[PDB]
């Protein structure tokens, strides 16, 4: 019924390992099967550089990768099940940043939502 997003404020992991940035969302059009785009960006909401982008075709559960920085970002959540959780592989100290979760439906301009508050990823050495 309403757009909303569930994202923890903090995730910690050791450099060289893999971290999971969880993200789930609620949305209107509760059985939407149209074209979907999932985006993760870093640094700043709405304005930071994207680190991951995939898109799913109408009626398809496969979110095809359009962008994955260093090849180390991968979607774990099924977006047709309201899960946009992201896996970061082979973490580097430079990955210690704030990340923001974003989804875009097709249709009206307001069928899109990005986490106003992001998840801080802590990379331990």
């Amino acid at each position: 019924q309403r757009w909303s997003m569930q994202v923890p404020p903090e995730v910690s992991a050791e450099a060289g390992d893999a971290a999971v940035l969880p993200c789930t969302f609620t949305h209107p059009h509760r059985h939407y099967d149209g074209p979907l785009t999932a985006i993760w960006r870093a640094g700043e909401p709405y304005a930071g550089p994207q680190v991951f982008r995939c898109a799913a075709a109408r009626g398809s559960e496969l979110c095809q990768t359009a962008l994955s920085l260093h090849g180390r970002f991968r979607l774990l959540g099924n977006p047709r099940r309201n899960d946009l959780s992201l896996r970061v592989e082979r973490l580097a100290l430079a990955d210690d940043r704030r990340y923001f979760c974003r989804v875009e439906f097709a249709g009206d301009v307001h069928d899109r939502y990005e986490s106003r508050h992001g998840v801080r990823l802590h990379v331990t050495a």
Partner: antibody, heavy 122, light 108 residues
């Protein structure tokens, strides 16, 4: 030493436009987000919009989407809010405010400007 | 769109009283609730953010609490400087929405 300086007052004719300024000093301008807030006297506060001074990225209250325009001038470290087709219903105090670490779960407003009293009148 | 209702609209309190004002949101705002104090002719002043975090320099008699939809601010012993209007603000999603404010007047 953080400061956000707004002109104390502006008198503008109905129908015209006004460009309100919020001059920053004492910090790295491009690293922070600035928010604009309206206060009509005797009433409370209402959010107008946010702008990232490092990228000119803006988010607006839909209520103001045809009324207000947020810009920044990074050469003079000045944020601007333009209000068009002014009427007497626009007479109000307008604040700019700076966010600490916008986007962190721990962000908050860490500095308020003094506000501009806008009087719309012939 | 998210509605914010503060209680009370106004109140009288004495020096040294323990005062609590409340703010309720029409949705879960995930503890992104901030409190401001404003006196006539001056700009607002941020007191509390993330529902329970004190801005540095704010006196320890101020505290905030709450989760989901229900939030409060408490002054454990009122001082004369604590007069003013108090506003809550959800900044969980756009558009940000303020409460209508609580006018705190001192009885002496």
């Amino acid at each position: 030493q953080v400061q956000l300086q707004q002109p104390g007052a502006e008198l503008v004719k109905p129908g015209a436009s006004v460009k309100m300024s919020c001059k920053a000093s004492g910090y790295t301008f491009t690293s922070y987000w600035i928010t604009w807030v309206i206060q009509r006297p005797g009433q409370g506060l209402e959010w107008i919009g946010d702008i990232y001074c490092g990228s000119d990225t803006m988010h607006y209250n839909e209520k103001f989407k045809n009324k207000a325009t947020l810009t920044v001038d990074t050469s003079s470290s000045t944020a601007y809010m333009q209000l068009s087709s002014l009427t007497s219903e626009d007479s109000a105090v307008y604040y700019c405010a700076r966010w600490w670490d916008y986007g962190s779960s721990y962000d908050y407003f860490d500095y308020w400007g003094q506000g501009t009293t806008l009087t719309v009148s012939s | 769109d998210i509605k914010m209702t503060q209680s009370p609209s106004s109140m009288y309190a004495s020096l040294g009283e323990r005062v609590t004002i409340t703010c309720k949101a029409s949705q879960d705002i995930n503890s992104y609730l901030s409190w401001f104090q404003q006196k006539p002719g001056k700009s607002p002043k941020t007191l509390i953010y993330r529902a329970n975090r004190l801005v540095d320099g704010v006196p320890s008699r101020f505290s905030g609490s709450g989760s989901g939809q229900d939030y409060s601010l408490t002054i454990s012993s009122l001082e004369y400087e604590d007069m003013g209007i108090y506003y809550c603000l959800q900044y969980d999603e756009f558009p940000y929405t303020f409460g209508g404010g609580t006018k705190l007047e001192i009885k002496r």
